[PDB]
Write a protein that holds these residues in place. Structure first.
Motif, mmCIF file in Angstrom:
data_model
loop_
_atom_site.group_PDB
_atom_site.id
_atom_site.type_symbol
_atom_site.label_atom_id
_atom_site.label_comp_id
_atom_site.label_asym_id
_atom_site.label_seq_id
_atom_site.Cartn_x
_atom_site.Cartn_y
_atom_site.Cartn_z
ATOM 1 N N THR A 185 0.743 -1.251 0.122
ATOM 2 C CA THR A 185 -0.003 0.018 -0.045
ATOM 3 C C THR A 185 0.833 1.369 -0.160
ATOM 4 O O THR A 185 1.959 1.274 0.250
ATOM 5 C CB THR A 185 -0.843 0.031 1.098
ATOM 6 N N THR A 186 0.143 2.489 -0.694
ATOM 7 C CA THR A 186 0.863 3.549 -0.370
ATOM 8 C C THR A 186 0.616 4.484 0.685
ATOM 9 O O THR A 186 -0.687 4.560 0.973
ATOM 10 C CB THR A 186 0.756 4.388 -1.916
ATOM 11 N N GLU A 187 1.428 5.301 1.201
ATOM 12 C CA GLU A 187 1.127 6.226 2.126
ATOM 13 C C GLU A 187 2.203 7.713 1.891
ATOM 14 O O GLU A 187 3.443 7.527 1.668
ATOM 15 C CB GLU A 187 1.563 6.019 3.591
ATOM 16 N N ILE A 188 1.341 8.760 1.378
ATOM 17 C CA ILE A 188 2.167 9.982 0.937
ATOM 18 C C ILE A 188 1.873 10.801 2.035
ATOM 19 O O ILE A 188 0.884 11.514 2.885
ATOM 20 C CB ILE A 188 1.261 10.497 -0.337
ATOM 21 N N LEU A 189 3.074 11.404 2.435
ATOM 22 C CA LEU A 189 3.144 12.400 3.644
ATOM 23 C C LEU A 189 4.193 13.506 3.137
ATOM 24 O O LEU A 189 5.177 13.625 2.584
ATOM 25 C CB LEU A 189 3.882 11.811 4.920
ATOM 26 N N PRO A 190 3.297 14.802 3.150
ATOM 27 C CA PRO A 190 4.143 15.974 2.967
ATOM 28 C C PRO A 190 5.327 16.046 4.002
ATOM 29 O O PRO A 190 5.141 15.804 5.223
ATOM 30 C CB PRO A 190 3.194 16.971 3.103
ATOM 31 N N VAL A 191 6.363 16.750 3.485
ATOM 32 C CA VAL A 191 7.468 16.909 4.487
ATOM 33 C C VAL A 191 7.959 18.450 4.645
ATOM 34 O O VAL A 191 8.242 18.896 5.792
ATOM 35 C CB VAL A 191 8.827 16.016 4.085
ATOM 36 N N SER A 192 8.150 19.213 3.544
ATOM 37 C CA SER A 192 8.511 20.583 3.633
ATOM 38 C C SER A 192 7.655 21.465 2.723
ATOM 39 O O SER A 192 6.801 20.778 1.554
ATOM 40 C CB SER A 192 10.061 20.718 2.943
ATOM 41 N N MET A 193 7.530 22.741 2.741
ATOM 42 C CA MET A 193 6.906 23.484 1.748
ATOM 43 C C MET A 193 8.149 24.163 0.838
ATOM 44 O O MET A 193 9.140 24.138 1.225
ATOM 45 C CB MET A 193 6.045 24.597 2.584
ATOM 46 N N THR A 194 7.660 25.077 -0.005
ATOM 47 C CA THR A 194 8.325 26.212 -0.441
ATOM 48 C C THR A 194 8.879 27.093 0.326
ATOM 49 O O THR A 194 8.047 27.770 1.085
ATOM 50 C CB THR A 194 7.656 26.711 -1.978
ATOM 51 N N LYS A 195 10.306 27.397 0.263
ATOM 52 C CA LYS A 195 10.847 28.481 1.152
ATOM 53 C C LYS A 195 10.441 29.887 0.468
ATOM 54 O O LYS A 195 11.273 30.106 -0.350
ATOM 55 C CB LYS A 195 12.359 27.986 1.282
ATOM 56 N N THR A 196 9.745 30.520 1.129
ATOM 57 C CA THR A 196 9.187 31.824 0.607
ATOM 58 C C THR A 196 9.855 33.169 1.333
ATOM 59 O O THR A 196 9.647 32.700 2.742
ATOM 60 C CB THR A 196 7.771 31.916 0.309
ATOM 61 N N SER A 197 10.625 33.880 1.016
ATOM 62 C CA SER A 197 10.903 35.045 1.732
ATOM 63 C C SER A 197 10.417 36.390 1.131
ATOM 64 O O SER A 197 10.290 36.580 -0.201
ATOM 65 C CB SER A 197 12.654 35.392 1.761
ATOM 66 N N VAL A 198 9.681 37.365 1.813
ATOM 67 C CA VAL A 198 9.366 38.515 1.623
ATOM 68 C C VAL A 198 10.065 39.623 1.978
ATOM 69 O O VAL A 198 10.272 39.896 3.297
ATOM 70 C CB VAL A 198 7.902 38.777 1.777
ATOM 71 N N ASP A 199 10.631 40.541 1.477
ATOM 72 C CA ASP A 199 11.064 41.700 1.736
ATOM 73 C C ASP A 199 9.876 42.814 2.220
ATOM 74 O O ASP A 199 9.365 43.214 1.235
ATOM 75 C CB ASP A 199 12.077 42.287 0.572
ATOM 76 N N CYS A 200 9.868 42.939 3.411
ATOM 77 C CA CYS A 200 8.730 43.720 3.768
ATOM 78 C C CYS A 200 8.880 45.189 3.416
ATOM 79 O O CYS A 200 7.639 45.906 3.100
ATOM 80 C CB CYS A 200 8.827 43.672 5.521
#
Ligand SMILES: *[C@@H]1O[C@H](CO)[C@@H](O[C@@H]2O[C@H](CO)[C@@H](O)[C@H](O)[C@H]2NC(C)=O)[C@H](O)[C@H]1NC(C)=O
Ligand SMILES: *[C@@H]1O[C@H](CO)[C@@H](O[C@@H]2O[C@H](CO)[C@@H](O)[C@H](O)[C@H]2NC(C)=O)[C@H](O)[C@H]1NC(C)=O
Ligand SMILES: *[C@@H]1O[C@H](CO)[C@@H](O[C@@H]2O[C@H](CO)[C@@H](O)[C@H](O)[C@H]2NC(C)=O)[C@H](O)[C@H]1NC(C)=O
Ligand SMILES: *[C@@H]1O[C@H](CO)[C@@H](O[C@@H]2O[C@H](CO)[C@@H](O)[C@H](O)[C@H]2NC(C)=O)[C@H](O)[C@H]1NC(C)=O
Ligand SMILES: *[C@@H]1O[C@H](CO)[C@@H](O[C@@H]2O[C@H](CO)[C@@H](O)[C@H](O)[C@H]2NC(C)=O)[C@H](O)[C@H]1NC(C)=O
Ligand SMILES: *[C@@H]1O[C@H](CO)[C@@H](O)[C@H](O)[C@H]1NC(C)=O
Lengths: 50, 106, 170
Positions: A29-44
Motif C-alpha cells: 500500500t502507498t502512504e503519501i506524507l508531505p515533508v516541507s514547503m516552498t521556502k518563501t521570503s518577502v522583503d517587507c
C-alpha cells in the motif's frame, strides 16, 4: 441519498468455533506524507514601499 | 501505523516536497471454520497450547499456529500441563501423544 | 445590507475571500477528522443475537434496542451529560451513524478480536481471545481459564463502576 457506512457483515460467532486462515496475500500500500514547503521570503520594505 | 494488515516491511520513496512509503504487509486469506477448545483433558490433566491453538476438523484434534493453518499432532512438546480437568470450562477429552513412548517401547 | 459599506469594503480587496476560505478549510477539516477517527472499518459488523460470551457482560456498551437512538447506556449518558451572517454547518456524519460505527467496532473487537483490523474478520470465542490478550502481556493461558469467572465478575463490576462514576461526576 442517505450514505451507507459499509456492507453489513454478521460475524458467525459461537462459543466453540474459530476461523483459521489457510492462505495469505502480500499487500503493498502507498502512504503519501508531505515533508516541507516552498521556502518563501518577502522583503517587507520592498513589498510595502518598493 | 505502517499499512493495513500485519506489517512486514516498508520502502521509502522520494516525492516533490514529500515522502511515499510503500508498506508491504501480510493479509490473511481463505479462512476456514474449525471446532476449538480451550484445553485438552488427558490422564486427569489439562493441557494447553504453548504457542498455538487447538482445532478440530470434525473427528481429530490438532494444534496449529494462530495466523496460519498448519495442523500438527498434539504432543507433550507443544503443550504444557497446568492443573486438572475440573476447573477449565469447556475442556474436551482427547489423547496426547508422547514422543518418548516408542523409544522405551522398542 | 448597506450598499455604500460594501462599495467601501471592495477597496480593501480579497480579505473576505481569505476569511471564507479559512473557515471552509476548518469546516472540511472537522469532517476529515471525524472520518479519520471513526470510519476505520468498511464492514458493519453485528453482534450475535445470543449474548453468550463466557460470563462477560457488554450490555452497558452495546447498543440498546429499546432506545430509538440505538445508543449504548454509556453513550446515552454521555450525550445527556454534554450540553448577523453566522451559520452553523451540520456535520457530515450524524450521531446515529457515528454510534453505528462504534457499534461495528465493538462487534468486531468482541466477536473477532484484532483480526478484523488487519484483514477479514475471523471469529474466535471471547475467553480464548482474552487468553490471547493475556499471552500478549506475558501471562499464561491457564491463569485466564482457571480464573475465568473471577475475571468476568471483575470486568462487569468495573464496567458498572465506570457508569456510576460518569453519572456521579460533573
Ligand atoms: C462458518 O460457519 C458459519 C455458520 O455455519 C458460516 O456462517 C454462515 O455462512 C452462510 C454462507 O454464506 C451464510 O448464508 C450465513 O448467514 C452465515 N451465518 C451467520 C450467522 O453469519 C460461515 O460462513 C462459515 N465460514 C466458513 C469460512 O465457511
Ligand atoms: C493461496 O493463494 C494463492 C494466490 O496468491 C494461490 O496461488 C495460485 O494458485 C493457482 C492454482 O494453481 C494458480 O493458477 C495461480 O497462478 C496462483 N497464483 C499465484 C500468484 O501464484 C495458492 O495456490 C493458494 N494456496 C492454497 C493452499 O490455497
Ligand atoms: C481430519 O484430518 C485427519 C488428518 O488428516 C483425517 O484423518 C485422515 O483421514 C483420511 C481420509 O479418511 C485417512 O486416509 C487418513 O489415514 C486419516 N489419518 C489418520 C491419522 O487417521 C480426518 O479424516 C479428518 N476429518 C475430517 C472430518 O475431515
Ligand atoms: C471425559 O473424561 C472424564 C474422565 O474419564 C469423564 O468424567 C467421567 O464422567 C462419568 C460420567 O459422568 C463419571 O461417572 C466419571 O466418574 C467421570 N470421571 C472423572 C474422573 O471425572 C468425562 O465425562 C468425559 N467427557 C466426555 C465428554 O467424554
Ligand atoms: C448483564 O448486565 C445487565 C446490567 O448490569 C443486567 O441487566 C439487569 O438485570 C437485572 C435482572 O434482570 C435487572 O434487575 C436490572 O435492572 C438489569 N439492569 C439494567 C441496566 O437493565 C443483565 O441481566 C446482565 N446479564 C445478561 C446475561 O445480560
Ligand atoms: C456453548 O454453549 C452451549 C449452549 O448454547 C453449551 O451447551 C456448551 O457447553 C458451551 N460450550 C462452551 C465451550 O462454553
Amino acid at each position: 441519498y442517505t450514505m451507507s457506512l459499509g456492507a453489513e457483515n454478521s460475524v458467525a460467532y459461537s462459543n466453540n468455533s474459530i476461523a483459521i486462515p489457510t492462505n495469505f496475500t502480500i499487500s503493498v500500500t502507498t502512504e503519501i506524507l508531505p515533508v516541507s514547503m516552498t521556502k518563501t521570503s518577502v522583503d517587507c520594505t520592498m513589498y510595502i514601499c518598493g | 501505523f505502517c499499512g493495513k494488515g500485519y506489517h512486514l516491511m516498508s520502502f521509502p520513496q522520494s516525492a516533490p516536497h514529500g515522502v511515499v512509503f510503500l508498506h508491504v504487509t501480510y493479509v490473511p486469506a481463505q479462512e476456514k471454520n474449525f471446532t476449538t477448545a480451550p484445553a485438552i483433558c488427558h490422564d486427569g490433566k489439562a493441557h494447553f497450547p504453548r504457542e498455538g491453538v487447538f482445532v478440530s476438523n470434525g473427528t481429530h484434534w490438532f494444534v496449529t499456529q494462530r495466523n496460519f493453518y498448519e495442523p500438527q499432532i498434539i504432543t507433550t512438546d507443544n503443550t504444557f500441563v497446568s492443573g486438572n480437568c475440573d476447573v477449565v470450562i469447556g475442556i474436551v477429552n482427547n489423547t496426547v501423544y508422547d514422543p518418548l513412548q516408542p523409544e522405551l517401547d522398542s | 445590507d448597506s450598499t455604500e459599506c460594501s462599495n467601501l469594503l471592495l477597496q480593501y480587496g480579497s480579505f473576505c475571500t481569505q476569511l471564507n476560505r479559512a473557515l471552509t478549510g476548518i469546516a472540511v477539516e472537522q469532517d476529515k477528522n471525524t472520518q479519520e477517527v471513526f470510519a476505520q472499518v468498511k464492514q458493519i459488523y453485528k453482534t450475535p443475537p445470543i449474548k453468550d460470551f463466557g460470563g462477560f457482560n457488554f450490555s452497558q456498551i452495546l447498543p440498546d434496542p429499546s432506545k430509538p437512538s440505538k445508543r449504548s447506556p454509556i453513550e446515552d449518558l454521555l450525550f445527556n451529560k454534554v450540553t448577523n451572517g453566522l451559520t452553523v454547518l451540520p456535520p457530515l456524519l450524524t450521531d446515529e451513524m457515528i454510534a453505528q460505527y462504534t457499534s461495528a467496532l465493538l462487534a468486531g473487537t468482541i466477536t473477532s478480536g484484532w483480526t478484523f483490523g488487519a484483514g477479514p474478520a475471523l471469529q474466535i470465542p471471547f475467553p480464548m481471545q482474552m487468553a490471547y490478550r493475556f499471552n500478549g502481556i506475558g501471562v499464561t493461558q491457564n491463569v485466564l481459564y482457571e480464573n475465568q469467572k473471577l475475571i468476568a465478575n471483575q470486568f462487569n463490576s468495573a464496567i458498572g463502576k465506570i457508569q456510576d462514576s460518569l453519572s456521579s461526576t460533573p
